[PDB]
Design a protein around this ligand. Structure first.
Ligand SMILES: Nc1ncnc2c1ncn2[C@@H]1O[C@H](COP(=O)(O)OP(=O)(O)NP(=O)(O)O)[C@@H](O)[C@H]1O
Ligand SMILES: Nc1ncnc2c1ncn2[C@@H]1O[C@H](COP(=O)(O)OP(=O)(O)NP(=O)(O)O)[C@@H](O)[C@H]1O
Ligand SMILES: [Mg+2]
Ligand SMILES: [Mg+2]
Lengths: 490, 484
């Protein structure tokens, strides 16, 4: 997997932090390098100008209702709190579709005009169900009647109960009523003709239902079952509105996922000062800023591959930015080809590469017989076998992991093989014969990361044409190595 | 990665955890870490290894993870009948494990598992009150079955009286039947409404049946009150010996970790290596390498030598070998046996450091990830430090990296550290043969088969053989030809 070597999912995860739901999160994970990304980029470019013009678009209610949609598809009825979620999400779909028709943005308009209006469903839910989740009296007249009769009956028992309390103050432990039954004391149990239900943990209370309370409690309990039965009919009738338009609802959920993936990419562009770069025939970075470096630390990278060139060998000091710069070419190419905007300045150009390959990093596994040399070389054999004119190749620390005289000879032959095959390559190295082969070969270009002599530090500037060295002693000193060991080394 | 992670230590501990009887031993195996005095831990493994070959597997039935039942007691809550049976079978598994070790000749086993306190009374009180299926027997208490005798005798009586009421009151009954609902006998009386309670033809409960159906409800709630009285009296038997109980759960966890280590050594042909004064691997087999693929490793650090410099072919085993010295040392100090031969010697090192590269955009490069660790190791290396340095000097130009590798090795040798390194830089190789504290080693390569053999050749330096190994991994011959 070459995208992982170029930190591709780490940058997508940065974009996913702006998604308004886990719908766009899942859809962003579907965006991978394609040969024809123009439609995806123009959609990002359209919503980008939208933000600059009219600000953030309407987004209230655009939550992840994937679970609720499956429950309807499964045939089950939705709970009142689920119908509220689906409704506020469907009303959000209505506002989003409407808002994209009064504006100038074409591709946004034709794409999300495919949303399905559920204005009928949103009205029934807002009429039957209130904000806290209860069923409103306005739902059905039948429920309205049962509640009135249940309240009228419950007001009678509570009046009769307070009469039983004031008149039977000698048989009651606590002078009250419970749950509708009475806390009568045992021993004084057979005093009132009634039905025994529950006993106290010490055998003191006999929680009894008096004679004149049995049929009344039963009438109230039937009214409650009537209320429960009517609510289940109200919820079924509401969920059926969604069941009858299941395809319309599932299309609304995918379109919000797509819009959410576009919404996250646009807000990523404004935080990082992004630019929508489209496939060109040149590779030029203009003040490119790696999204994984903090803004306070990042130094923009300027690089341009001349048209008469095919390879870029990068040398320079340790921690000078050789690998990061080589990563930015592969990453930004894979990002544009996926449909993402790029943290760079206007004028940046990149080129569609059907084959993007990278050899970055070393893996040590005993199980996979993986060694420093083996993990690199097993990728090299992969790349060499499939490198052609459509291939862009990123080779990090070519020739490292073995005898320097043999690694530098392997490094030069591999570069030669990719060049003959018509591949575009970006290479880091710290071996001298590789630097020499780069300036001897007319298809190769040498560049180095800048090193400040007075400050003994890297400046992260790309100097084209000049090779550079590792400066290992000054970097080891900055990394904390004792001055004793270094003065010894020099 | 920390030092133990660089040596695949937790990956190996994961192998032994597969042999545990329960999560009691899996959790305890996660606590075993390199200690300076591992003698008792290793002697217990050896004694249990002796027991296995002598008497077979020890008694193990009932030694499940009952940690949750022990915590429920801690919270004062009473335990359900099935929880009573789980704990009762664990404690019985403790009494059979104790009695088995006391009749043997393994001191540290008996002595350690003597602190096992047996709950013979709790086992007998659970087996008498609780039945195997989870029901409450009648011997549980004299009141329990007096209630059940009166409940059974009453239940047969109301039903007989219900049938009599139907047959003797047909004139007032809509249909000849009785209704049972919510534990009450109900009768379909016509408008000719017999005194009693009407539960919503009128469904009527005659006054005779009101007091009788009541008595049914009282006796059923009295049974529930008595079973909880017993479930609490049962739980409290353990609470009076809760310290004995929690000690019993740890002692079984310690046994389970021993049981797992013995089963691991028994399966990998393991040897209990104890601390010595020297380092010598006699046919060491790295446990992460498949059994039908590993080649045993032989290696020995001479007593006048404190640095092992391993060179040789790419994919030749330089790293895994030097890793094996560090891993087998850490495992030994943690109480584990080792896949090696009788004769292997390892030495206790209170400080174990390793270097085996991270690449992260918060200032970690190839050179940085290594050198950031080196500065940490140099800062803390002393006379009892075992230091493992993989690919020392890589990540820079060959010239300065070689001068940095030599200065670090000799700075660490001066501190008194024992050091195992891998390298492929010629100046480091030459430094190893000219310095009195250094020894040069190399992994063998077969020229005919053009493949490494993973045999340690001591005394001579070696070579990477990149061209041949790149050929064995598939790189086209024309690239290799252009390289040579
Ligand atoms: N353009 C940049 N602006 C700011 N910081 C940067 C830039 N490029 C790199 N860095 C930082 O510097 C570090 C050096 O990264 P890296 O590219 O691996 O150096 P390197 O040249 O590869 N060192 P090495 O591979 O060991 O020879 C990165 O991890 C970032 O933290
Ligand atoms: N004794 C052994 N028996 C069997 N397989 C082994 C043995 N030692 C090593 N291997 C295998 O060989 C692989 C290479 O080992 P490794 O120690 O990484 O070589 P290396 O010398 O470090 N190569 P490099 O570091 O890139 O120069 C390991 O991942 C194992 O799969
Ligand atoms: Mg690097
Ligand atoms: Mg290695």
């Amino acid at each position: 997997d070459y995208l992982e070597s170029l930190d591709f999912p780490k940058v997508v995860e940065i974009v996913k932090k702006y998604a308004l739901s886990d719908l766009g999160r899942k859809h962003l994970d579907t965006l991978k390098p394609t040969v024809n990304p123009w439609d995806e980029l123009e959609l990002v470019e359209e919503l980008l100008n939208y933000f600059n013009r009219w600000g953030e678009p309407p987004i209230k209610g655009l939550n992840d209702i994937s679970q609720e949609v499956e429950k309807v598809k499964s045939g089950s009825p939705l709970e009142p709190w689920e119908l509220l979620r689906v409704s506020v999400f469907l009303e959000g779909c209505d506002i989003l579709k409407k808002e994209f028709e009064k504006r100038e943005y074409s591709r946004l308009k034709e794409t999300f005009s495919r949303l399905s209006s559920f204005r009928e469903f949103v009205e029934e839910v807002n009429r039957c169900i209130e904000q806290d989740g209860e069923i409103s009296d306005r739902a059905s007249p039948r429920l309205r009647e049962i509640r009135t009769e249940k309240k009228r009956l419950s007001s009678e028992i509570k009046r009769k109960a307070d009469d039983f309390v004031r008149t039977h103050s000698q048989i009651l432990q606590e002078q009250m009523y419970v749950y509708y039954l009475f806390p009568v004391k045992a021993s004084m149990k057979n005093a009132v003709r009634g039905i025994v239900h529950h006993l106290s943990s010490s055998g003191a209370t006999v929680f009894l239902e008096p004679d004149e309370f049995v049929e009344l409690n039963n009438r109230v309990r039937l009214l409650e079952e009537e209320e429960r039965l009517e609510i289940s009919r109200i919820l079924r009738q509401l969920t059926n509105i969604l069941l009858s338009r299941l395809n319309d609802l599932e299309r609304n959920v995918e379109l919000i996922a797509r819009f959410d993936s576009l919404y996250a990419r646009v807000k990523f562009a404004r935080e990082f000062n992004g630019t929508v770069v489209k496939p060109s025939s040149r590779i030029r970075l203009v003040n490119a800023r790696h999204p994984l470096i903090p803004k306070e630390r990042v130094v923009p990278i300027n690089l341009e591959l001349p048209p008469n060139k095919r390879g870029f060998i990068i040398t320079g000091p340790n921690m000078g930015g050789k690998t990061v710069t080589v990563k930015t070419v592969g990453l930004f190419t894979a990002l544009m080809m996926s449909g993402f905007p790029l943290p760079c300045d206007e004028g940046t150009e990149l080129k569609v590469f059907p084959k993007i390959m990278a050899d970055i990093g070393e893996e040590q596994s005993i199980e996979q017989s993986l060694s420093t040399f083996s993990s690199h070389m097993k990728k090299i054999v992969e790349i060499v076998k499939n490198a052609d004119s459509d291939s862009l190749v990123i080779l990090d620390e070519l020739g490292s992991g073995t005898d320097p005289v043999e690694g530098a000879a392997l490094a030069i032959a591999i570069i030669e093989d990719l060049l003959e095959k018509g591949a575009t390559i970006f290479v880091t190295t710290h071996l001298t014969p590789v630097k020499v082969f780069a300036m001897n070969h007319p298809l190769l270009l040498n560049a180095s990361m800048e090193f400040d002599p007075e400050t003994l530090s890297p400046t992260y500037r790309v100097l084209v044409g000049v090779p550079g060295g590792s400066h290992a002693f000054q970097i080891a000193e900055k990394l904390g190595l004792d001055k004793r060991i270094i003065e010894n080394a020099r």
